[PDB]
Paper text:
In this study, we present the crystal structure of mouse MILL2 at 2.15 Å resolution. The domain structures of MILL2 are similar to those of MHC-I molecules which typically associate with β2m. Instead of typical immunological roles, MILLs were reported to be involved in nutrient metabolism and wound healing in mice. Notably, an unusual basic patch on the α3 domain of MILL2 bestows HS binding capacity.
Unexpectedly, two different conformations of MILL2 were observed in the asymmetric crystal unit. One conformation is essentially similar to typical MHC-I molecules, whereas, in the other, the α1-α2 domains are located distantly from the α3-β2m domains exposing the interface between the α1-α2 and α3-β2m domains. MILL2 is the first β2m-associated MHC-I molecule shown to form both open and closed conformations. In particular, the α1-α2 domains of H-2Db form 108 interactions but the corresponding domains of MILL2 form only 97. These results demonstrate that although MILL2 associates with β2m by the same interface, the molecular packing between MILL2 and β2m is less tight than that of classical MHC-I. On the other hand, the tight proximity of the two helices formed by the α1-α2 domains leaves too little space to bind ligand. By contrast, the interhelical space of MILL2 is filled with amino acid side chains from both helices. Interestingly, electrostatic analysis also revealed another large basic patch located on the exposed surface of the α3 domain in both closed and open conformations. This region is composed of Arg194, Arg200, Lys229, Arg232, Arg247 and Arg251. In the crystal structure of MILL2, a SO4 ion from the crystallization buffer is located on the edge of the unique basic patch in the α3 domain, proximal to Arg251. Interestingly, binding to heparin by the basic patch on MILL2 released β2m, indicating that heparin-bound MILL2 adopts the open conformation.
Author numbering:
A (entry chain D): 1 to 98
B (entry chain A): 6 to 180, 184 to 275
C (entry chain B): 1 to 97
D (entry chain C): 6 to 54, 63 to 86, 96 to 104, 112 to 120, 124 to 128, 131 to 136, 143 to 174, 185 to 275
The structure:
């Protein structure tokens, strides 16, 4: 039976505007093992997005890490949009630096 | 980023006038147009495109293709004439076109092949032809002068081809389904089980399949334009097999990556 | 100077017994372009076989896709047989699963 | 608290029909080393983090193969450390008292691996293997005047070598909130290392009293707001 994916978006290293970095989209606890992941910059699709192998967790669920190279600025927004059969609509989670 | 590629081949080397050509046009690695001047062909023209007004588009662009074949013949006339003098049966090929970069600029290319080997290459920076194989200085100079004129080459690659690509991309915009994976098992060979993972319904020629044992890759294959399998309906497929011991099947999962999709199936 | 063909035989769709499908015979990486391709059902030539244009890849070697309609059964065998100057004898590749 | 586990299966190599062991080595329950002598298009030596290890791997394969020569002559076995264990079978046999616990008894007891060589492997040689197999983290704190009436403090720990970590919020040295990170709550950074995060809301003006403490392995690292 289906489980809804949890989505977390975060930088690989401590973020600094103008410094090259990696933005991660960590997608966990979903089922069935079919996911669709898109990463967005200012609402527009990022062409080169890397995905790890899908993994199985002990709680009978799957997870995967997507990421893309980026150079953060003050005004650029980043987001991860995810499609999965447990969700009627795609789910978007914006990068929040804090 | 987008690519326009012309794959040209002479059927038999008679002369610059009588030599018949097969021209295949690829947009983003997908066959889009064909002209085959082979006299024995009942359908000399071909056009692969979907959507409304597709038939009108084919009428226009196959007619445009006829003009391209004329230009290519003209530019390559002297190479064709010189190779037509060779004894026996030989194969002349060309690949050429342009690449639209995401920053709006254009990269052109033009290569010739002879008997299945690199022959000539047009140097974009130098604006001269490079002889690719081992060659005397005499033969280098010879081909540098009989190869397609540099000013004609550059106009075609820098101006004409990019305009064609732009026109093609517009007609293509009128763009389904997700990829799928199957896993089959066979008791073969004798003391083994062959696990076969197949991915179907790939929309492009890019995909990766990996066999995983306890989360760890034991076999991995990346498929590209020239290694992925055409399914025949305009979609693509891929395949990776491994051999395991009887009873081990539950330990192994196949993971497909294609576009934005990641799909996993356990054996 | 001469390149031996690679021969792959595979269904267009996931095969199921009794359900109409298409059998592909994908012949690649050969030179010279002249080649003979036959598809076989139970050892005998299948009359209506479609074939793509013969194109070529970056290393100039040629490829062509042959295919035919078929309905897979438990007992019927299928094969693709290819003749090329690079080989002494015709090469035959049987379909599996 | 640390587990070495060998999973082995008898099999024949395609060419010469002699028997080897396909061995899988699990340190702490994750696949670590693999030797498959009859691989074809896959790698015979597998390792995920070496070359020094794979060299020893070949040696422990023969050692294990030799010890089980009699019962090898579909045999599978699982053995390892931490207390040792060793089970056999064609899946039934267990190294309990220095004897093997199952006409069936007569056959298994005779062919079973020698109890002397087995005890030594489990007591000394295997722990050594497990022993053989077995920069600093950094902590950042950021603050935001948000939400209204509050300041939000966020503590992030980077460069964790393992997936275990504790982050503590302290106020003038007094623990206020705490979170211990597991698997499925720790965050992969994507470069082999892991990271974690805790946040807290305080009154405006409380910020200078607050500090974040990371406990990871033998590291105890402080960072103030």
């Amino acid at each position: 039976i289906q489980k809804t994916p949890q989505i977390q978006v975060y930088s690989r290293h401590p973020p600094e505007n103008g410094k090259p970095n990696i933005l991660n989209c960590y997608v966990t606890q979903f089922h069935p093992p079919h996911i669709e992941i898109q990463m967005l910059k200012n609402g527009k699709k990022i062409p080169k997005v890397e995905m790890s192998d899908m993994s199985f967790s002990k709680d009978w669920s799957f997870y995967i890490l997507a990421h893309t190279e980026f150079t953060p600025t003050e005004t650029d927004t980043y987001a991860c949009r995810v499609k999965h059969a447990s969700m009627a609509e795609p789910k978007t989670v914006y990068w929040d630096r804090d | 980023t987008h690519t326009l590629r012309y794959n040209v081949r002479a059927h038999s080397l008679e002369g610059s006038e009588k030599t018949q050509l097969l021209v295949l046009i690829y947009v983003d690695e997908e066959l889009f147009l064909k002209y085959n001047g082979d006299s024995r062909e009942t359908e000399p023209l071909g056009c692969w495109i979907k959507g409304h007004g597709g038939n009108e588009t084919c009428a226009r662009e196959t007619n445009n293709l006829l003009k391209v074949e004329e230009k290519l013949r003209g530019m390559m006339a002297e190479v064709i004439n010189q190779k037509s003098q060779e004894e026996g049966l030989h194969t002349l090929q060309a690949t050429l076109g342009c690449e639209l970069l995401s920053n709006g600029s254009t990269r052109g290319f033009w290569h010739l092949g002879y008997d299945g080997q690199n022959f000539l290459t047009f140097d974009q920076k130098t604006l001269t032809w490079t002889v690719d194989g081992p060659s005397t200085q005499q033969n280098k100079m010879f081909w540098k002068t009989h190869a397609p004129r540099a000013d004609l080459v550059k106009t075609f690659l820098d101006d004409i081809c990019p305009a064609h690509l732009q026109r093609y991309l517009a007609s293509l915009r009128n763009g389904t389904g997700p990829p799928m994976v199957t896993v089959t098992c066979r008791n073969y060979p004798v003391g083994r089980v062959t696990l076969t993972c197949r991915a179907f319904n790939l929309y492009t020629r890019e995909a990766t399949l990996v066999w995983l044992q306890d989360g760890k890759p034991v076999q991995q294959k990346t498929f590209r334009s020239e290694t992925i399998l055409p399914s025949g309906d305009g979609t693509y497929q891929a395949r990776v097999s491994i051999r395991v011991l009887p009873g081990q099947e539950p330990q192994f999962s196949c993971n497909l990556r294609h576009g934005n999709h990641s799909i996993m199936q356990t054996a």
